[PDB]
Subunit: 86 residues, 6 copies
């Protein structure tokens, strides 16, 4: 299924992204990951409409308190991707 | 129960955030976490009034000596969140 | 076989690079790797034409949403290299 | 017992902080910790007067050769804190 | 035997350094190592003429695509060094 | 015995520091350590005159090719220190 990602400067603004994502639509939180430099990513999985909706709300609410760096929906990640994230 | 987060540049200013949080109201300290770039987060759990009060005081005193980057209260984190933090 | 690499600032823009690479031609995703400072690299392996094509498309689409820092095709990495990456 | 912390840019200036702290008064060195971005913290434990004295001297001498970012004395850390550091 | 080192911003430009080093003369690739901040180092071992030649070529080609930060040849590293790198 | 430290931006300039230290006087290389942000430290142990001499030469030669951030000789580190480094 689809993949929603919000990447932030700082963990707290990511936790908010994550929280607001899971509340806003039927997505399961996969995890987070940071790549140094303050960059932290929250990743969720769901149907594409559900994921699209989480990321919209995730970004709205994380931006409210912090910096959203990038957000993305991949409606059907190559299988190779889906292996690597989960 | 609710979740209080204070993210700082540097560990020392975080340790102060944490200390002042636990003193200021009935919250238990979950842990800290850094995501590189000097960004360190202190996280506590309690009732929402108790958590709201810790963060107010946590931020007051960490700022006294260092840089508070983000603070947040989530009164009821999606269950998925509560799994990830603890 | 050949080696395609796209290095980005931030994980999300890398995940897109990776996704678009594997879709665009017959390459298998080896992995990713970050070296701090927000720098994350996606690496794939395939025939040189297939790899060249992934990287072209990987870069097109990662840039769409984020910053592509370096991209490279090594058509035949020294064997020592191929040992290190995989 | 009390807690003394000196956070520096760079390890060497921290090692000096630490050395000068333990020489200057009756404190035991707990450890150090870095949170990326060059930020390294030296932490000691002792009575509040002993700890206050180490940090004064720790800071004097680390600054001599490097950058002291934060210093702090917590005379009685919440028990939760004392669990986290040690 | 001697030691050749090329340090880069970013992994990809390092992988090129490495590849071009091993192709250009009779050296075996020891490994790479990053120290955060985007800084990644490729290290090879060989006779001093062979190593000198790799680094010349390693630097030429890594610079072609990325940033070479430092390069070095140590014709006979103190034994202590040779222990630490390998 | 005494402690000599040279901290550099980048590993390569550190390796040179280290090499030139061990050549220049009777010191044993303890190790290196990085604290992110490109900051890498080389640490040696010897008599104070031997250590003083290494660091002088270590710094001369590392600076030749890179950036020496801090250098230090501690002629007799508090015992607590000597425990932590080794």
């Amino acid at each position: 299924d689809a993949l929603g990602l919000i990447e932030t400067k700082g963990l707290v603004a990511c936790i908010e992204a994550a929280d607001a994502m899971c509340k806003a639509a039927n997505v399961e939180l996969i995890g987070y990951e940071n790549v140094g430099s303050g960059l932290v990513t929250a990743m969720v999985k769901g149907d594409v409409g559900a994921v699209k909706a989480a990321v919209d709300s995730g970004v709205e609410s994380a931006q409210r308190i912090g910096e959203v760096v990038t957000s993305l929906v991949i409606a059907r990640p190559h299988n190779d991707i889906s292996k690597i994230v989960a």
